[PDB]
Design an enzyme around this catalytic site. Structure first.
Site, PDB file in Angstrom:
ATOM      1  N   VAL A  30       0.798  -1.220   0.000  1.00  0.00           N
ATOM      2  CA  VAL A  30       0.000   0.000   0.000  1.00  0.00           C
ATOM      3  C   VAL A  30       0.851   1.300   0.000  1.00  0.00           C
ATOM      4  O   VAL A  30       0.334   2.377  -0.312  1.00  0.00           O
ATOM      5  CB  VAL A  30      -1.028  -0.056   1.174  1.00  0.00           C
ATOM      6  CG1 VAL A  30      -0.351   0.095   2.547  1.00  0.00           C
ATOM      7  CG2 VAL A  30      -2.108   0.972   0.997  1.00  0.00           C
ATOM      8  N   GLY A  33       8.327   4.065  -0.721  1.00  0.00           N
ATOM      9  CA  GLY A  33       9.126   5.295  -0.769  1.00  0.00           C
ATOM     10  C   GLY A  33      10.550   5.108  -0.289  1.00  0.00           C
ATOM     11  O   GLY A  33      11.054   3.986  -0.259  1.00  0.00           O
ATOM     12  N   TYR A  35      11.556   5.396   2.743  1.00  0.00           N
ATOM     13  CA  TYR A  35      11.302   4.527   3.912  1.00  0.00           C
ATOM     14  C   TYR A  35      11.330   3.008   3.686  1.00  0.00           C
ATOM     15  O   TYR A  35      11.575   2.248   4.632  1.00  0.00           O
ATOM     16  CB  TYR A  35       9.945   4.897   4.541  1.00  0.00           C
ATOM     17  CG  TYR A  35       8.748   4.830   3.592  1.00  0.00           C
ATOM     18  CD1 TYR A  35       8.096   3.613   3.322  1.00  0.00           C
ATOM     19  CD2 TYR A  35       8.248   5.993   2.985  1.00  0.00           C
ATOM     20  CE1 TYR A  35       6.989   3.558   2.458  1.00  0.00           C
ATOM     21  CE2 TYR A  35       7.143   5.943   2.123  1.00  0.00           C
ATOM     22  CZ  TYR A  35       6.522   4.725   1.865  1.00  0.00           C
ATOM     23  OH  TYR A  35       5.438   4.683   1.017  1.00  0.00           O
ATOM     24  N   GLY A  36      11.045   2.577   2.457  1.00  0.00           N
ATOM     25  CA  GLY A  36      11.044   1.168   2.086  1.00  0.00           C
ATOM     26  C   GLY A  36       9.685   0.790   1.529  1.00  0.00           C
ATOM     27  O   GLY A  36       9.262   1.359   0.527  1.00  0.00           O
ATOM     28  N   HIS A  37       8.996  -0.152   2.182  1.00  0.00           N
ATOM     29  CA  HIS A  37       7.741  -0.735   1.664  1.00  0.00           C
ATOM     30  C   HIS A  37       6.725  -0.901   2.793  1.00  0.00           C
ATOM     31  O   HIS A  37       7.101  -1.297   3.890  1.00  0.00           O
ATOM     32  CB  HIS A  37       7.995  -2.127   1.058  1.00  0.00           C
ATOM     33  CG  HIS A  37       9.253  -2.238   0.244  1.00  0.00           C
ATOM     34  ND1 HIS A  37       9.241  -2.542  -1.099  1.00  0.00           N
ATOM     35  CD2 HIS A  37      10.558  -2.132   0.593  1.00  0.00           C
ATOM     36  CE1 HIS A  37      10.484  -2.605  -1.545  1.00  0.00           C
ATOM     37  NE2 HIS A  37      11.301  -2.352  -0.540  1.00  0.00           N
ATOM     38  N   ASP A 149       9.424  16.714   9.483  1.00  0.00           N
ATOM     39  CA  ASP A 149       8.927  16.400   8.128  1.00  0.00           C
ATOM     40  C   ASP A 149       7.399  16.274   8.109  1.00  0.00           C
ATOM     41  O   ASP A 149       6.837  15.333   7.548  1.00  0.00           O
ATOM     42  CB  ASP A 149       9.575  15.101   7.618  1.00  0.00           C
ATOM     43  CG  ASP A 149       9.359  14.868   6.122  1.00  0.00           C
ATOM     44  OD1 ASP A 149       8.892  15.787   5.413  1.00  0.00           O
ATOM     45  OD2 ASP A 149       9.673  13.748   5.655  1.00  0.00           O
TER      46      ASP A 149
HETATM   47  C1  LIG Z   1       6.182   5.223   5.690  1.00  0.00           C
HETATM   48  N1  LIG Z   1       4.956   4.646   6.231  1.00  0.00           N
HETATM   49  C2  LIG Z   1       4.762   4.530   7.564  1.00  0.00           C
HETATM   50  O1  LIG Z   1       5.605   4.926   8.355  1.00  0.00           O
HETATM   51  C3  LIG Z   1       3.485   3.954   8.064  1.00  0.00           C
HETATM   52  C4  LIG Z   1       3.408   3.411   9.363  1.00  0.00           C
HETATM   53  C5  LIG Z   1       2.216   2.905   9.805  1.00  0.00           C
HETATM   54  C6  LIG Z   1       1.095   2.946   8.947  1.00  0.00           C
HETATM   55  C7  LIG Z   1      -0.156   2.445   9.340  1.00  0.00           C
HETATM   56  N2  LIG Z   1      -1.192   2.498   8.526  1.00  0.00           N
HETATM   57  C8  LIG Z   1      -1.110   3.016   7.305  1.00  0.00           C
HETATM   58  C9  LIG Z   1       0.076   3.533   6.813  1.00  0.00           C
HETATM   59  C10 LIG Z   1       0.124   4.117   5.464  1.00  0.00           C
HETATM   60  C11 LIG Z   1      -0.131   3.366   4.316  1.00  0.00           C
HETATM   61  C12 LIG Z   1      -0.069   3.971   3.076  1.00  0.00           C
HETATM   62  C13 LIG Z   1       0.251   5.353   2.934  1.00  0.00           C
HETATM   63  C14 LIG Z   1       0.489   6.073   4.095  1.00  0.00           C
HETATM   64  C15 LIG Z   1       0.427   5.470   5.339  1.00  0.00           C
HETATM   65  C16 LIG Z   1       0.819   7.528   3.846  1.00  0.00           C
HETATM   66  S1  LIG Z   1       0.736   7.622   2.036  1.00  0.00           S
HETATM   67  O2  LIG Z   1       2.038   7.786   1.498  1.00  0.00           O
HETATM   68  O3  LIG Z   1      -0.400   8.377   1.659  1.00  0.00           O
HETATM   69  N3  LIG Z   1       0.333   6.047   1.712  1.00  0.00           N
HETATM   70  C17 LIG Z   1       0.114   5.508   0.364  1.00  0.00           C
HETATM   71  C18 LIG Z   1       1.231   3.509   7.647  1.00  0.00           C
HETATM   72  N4  LIG Z   1       2.412   3.986   7.272  1.00  0.00           N
END
Ligand SMILES: CNC(=O)c1ccc2cncc(-c3ccc4c(c3)CS(=O)(=O)N4C)c2n1
EC number: 2.7.11.22
Lengths: 345, 266
Positions: A30, A33, A35-37, A149
């Site tokens: 989902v 970036g 950050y990875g995956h 950020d």
């Molecule tokens: C770098 N990611 C995280 O550190 C992270 C940690 C915990 C999460 C729990 N739930 C959902 C997300 C999530 C998933 C997708 C998504 C986003 C967030 C923002 S975004 O770029 O708009 N996108 C497509 C999460 N992300």
């Protein structure tokens, strides 16, 4: 290893929780970036039926970035900050996985939904979002943790479930070497653009100001097309909204590294007609509302004159009807779509 | 500064302030090969190894202290048999360094520091040179992190000590001696048993007694379990009697040969 105890090595191998055994996440990527995956995931050994988020970290080993993320999330606990639930270390591929509760939504996608529709909503949803963001950043700042950020994309919001409509701050910019910016410009405070050597609480608060303007207008307040920290066009855009700062407005501006550069490139005359009042008036927001007066304090030019998260939470805006609610949606049906699944290729 | 005011909800406090009897029960495994005196002599030695590693690498004291605690916590749970502590010690310095944000230790600099420190400052305990390559540290890092349950933020007695001496107004007189006494408490289990601030009050108490400053009314103006402070004072004083009666340089070859050793595969 020959000089590691075999019995210790196989006992720990017998007992290790492996991520691929515990969760189902195949084809459920989902996010992708720097950050990875990130994958949306269900639990196989099914005690609960909750959705989870699985972050596989870019690169291998333990990066300083990975380490500080693990170290800090391990201690931080607050409803408005994303919670680390578990950490899987995969010795073979040398990859690190982090487990979080799943947030279906975020402000990037949410605000882009209003932009799309209105181009062809619940009262207190903007207020509630702002309050919960301020509550989250306050928790971190009080623990001497900066975000570094802050933008709509990393302000997550919980979908259907027990924590319905709750803000979850995420992707805190852990690891900037020497706490340095110099090692999208839309959310960056004027001090950063003028060459500030370090991040601060005040820099986080500017970003919240920008997000607040954006929730009100559905438009990024300092929107701007498209090295060193000086960026001409981004400053021009700020000055088009805010006006050019007087000496009385920002006494220490002289002390910024790129002040000579600013003087060389910009003249006060250019922005004499400009102000935040007029900008917000053009975007149908009343300048004599408590909403506006708080925004004006968040988007103060001089960092030492910007209010803290503590004092923003104390603004009488949050005592005016409608109040903030824990559920941002206030019990109303969520019209926003669920997240989209990405590919490996 | 990160998490400064959060000790009472922190992972240090809630998981890594251990019971003395529990600690002593898990230790009995390694007491089949070593005596209680020899095991402590082992701990004192490896605390000096980590300090020496830190000084070579030019790390501040707080980073060294965190690496020291990582080591203690690990061997409070698992045997000296588990992983060679010659390998664990630089691994702890290496992991602790990454928790910081100002500057990075590289791979070749860590292995260079481990090699050089043991050959020049510890050749009384080690005939052969440091045999481990970098990928050994990296494998060991994963085990360290896992087996500490990802608990990386450690609180130390230095910060409360600075606060107390300035409260008294005796920074010039007491601080260098008290800071030094805090350094010595890492030769003991104190950090596994008492909150940091209690260790610091004890250290400042001893600094007062050595320098003959009377702080009876200042200490009285505190609200704290004084039995527990005295407990820590007794541990510090017992450490200095070991110090007297311990020749680290003469003894550690023999002790390190008594240490139980990792079983290899067939
Ligand atoms: C770098 N990611 C995280 O550190 C992270 C940690 C915990 C999460 C729990 N739930 C959902 C997300 C999530 C998933 C997708 C998504 C986003 C967030 C923002 S975004 O770029 O708009 N996108 C497509 C999460 N992300």
């Amino acid at each position: 290893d020959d000089k590691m105890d075999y019995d210790f090595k196989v006992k720990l191998s017998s007992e290790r929780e492996r991520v691929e055994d515990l969760f189902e996440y195949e084809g459920c990527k989902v996010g992708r970036g720097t950050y990875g995956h990130v994958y949306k995931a269900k639990r196989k050994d099914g005690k609960d039926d909750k959705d989870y988020a699985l972050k596989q970290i870019e690169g291998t080993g333990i990066s300083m970035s990975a380490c500080r993320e693990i170290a800090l999330l391990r201690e931080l606990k607050h409803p408005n900050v994303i919670s680390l639930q578990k950490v899987f270390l995969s010795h073979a591929d040398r990859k690190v996985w982090l487990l979080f509760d799943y947030a279906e939504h975020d402000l990037w996608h949410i605000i882009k939904f209003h932009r799309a529709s209105k181009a062809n909503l619940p009262r207190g949803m903007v207020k509630s979002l702002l309050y919960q963001i301020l509550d989250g950043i306050h928790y971190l700042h009080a623990n001497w943790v900066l975000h570094r950020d802050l933008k709509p994309a990393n302000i997550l919001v919980m979908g259907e479930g027990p924590e319905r409509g709750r803000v979850k701050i995420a992707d805190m910019g852990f690891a900037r070497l020497f706490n340095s910016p110099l090692k999208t410009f839309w959310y960056r405070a004027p001090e950063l653009l003028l060459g500030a050597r370090h991040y601060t609480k005040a820099i986080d608060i500017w970003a919240i100001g920008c997000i607040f303007a954006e929730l009100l207008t559905s438009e990024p307040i300092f929107h701007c097309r498209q090295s060193n920290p000086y960026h001409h066009d981004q400053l021009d855009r700020i000055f088009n909204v805010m006006g050019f700062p007087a000496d009385k407005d920002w006494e220490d501006i002289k002390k910024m590294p790129e002040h000579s550069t600013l003087m060389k490139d910009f003249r006060r005359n250019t922005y004499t007609n400009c102000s935040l009042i007029k900008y917000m008036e053009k975007h149908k927001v009343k300048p004599d509302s408590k909403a506006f007066h708080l925004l004006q304090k968040l988007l103060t030019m001089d960092p030492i004159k910007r209010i803290t998260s503590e004092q923003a939470m104390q603004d009488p805006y949050f005592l005016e009807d409608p109040l903030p609610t824990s559920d941002v949606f206030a019990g109303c049906q969520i019209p926003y779509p669920k997240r989209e699944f990405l590919t490996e290729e | 500064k990160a998490m400064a005011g959060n000790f009472w909800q922190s992972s240090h406090y809630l998981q890594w302030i251990l019971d003395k009897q529990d600690l002593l029960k898990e230790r009995q495994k390694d007491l089949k090969f070593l005596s209680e005196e020899e095991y402590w002599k082992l701990q004192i030695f490896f605390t000096n190894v980590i300090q020496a590693l830190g000084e070579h690498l030019k790390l501040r004291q707080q980073v060294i202290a965190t690496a020291t605690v990582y080591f203690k916590r690990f061997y409070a749970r698992y045997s000296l048999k588990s992983i060679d502590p010659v390998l664990m010690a630089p691994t702890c310095v290496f992991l602790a360094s990454k928790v910081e944000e100002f500057g990075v230790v590289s791979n070749t600099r860590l292995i260079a520091a481990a090699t050089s420190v043991l050959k020049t400052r510890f050749s009384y305990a080690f005939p052969k040179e440091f045999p481990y390559r970098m990928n050994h540290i990296l494998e060991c890092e994963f085990y360290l992190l896992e087996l500490m349950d990802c608990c990386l933020i450690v609180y130390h007695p230095y910060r409360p000590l600075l606060q107390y001496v300035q409260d008294m107004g005796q920074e010039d007189m007491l601080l260098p001696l008290a800071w030094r006494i805090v350094n010595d408490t890492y030769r003991t289990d104190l950090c596994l048993l008492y909150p940091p601030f209690m260790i610091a009050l004890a250290c400042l108490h001893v600094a007062c007694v050595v320098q003959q400053k009377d702080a009876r009314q200042w200490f009285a103006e505190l609200s704290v379990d004084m039995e527990k402070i005295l407990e820590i004072i007794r541990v510090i004083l017992k450490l200095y009697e070991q110090w007297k009666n311990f020749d680290e340089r003469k003894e550690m070859a023999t002790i390190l040969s008594k240490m139980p050793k990792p079983k290899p595969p067939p």
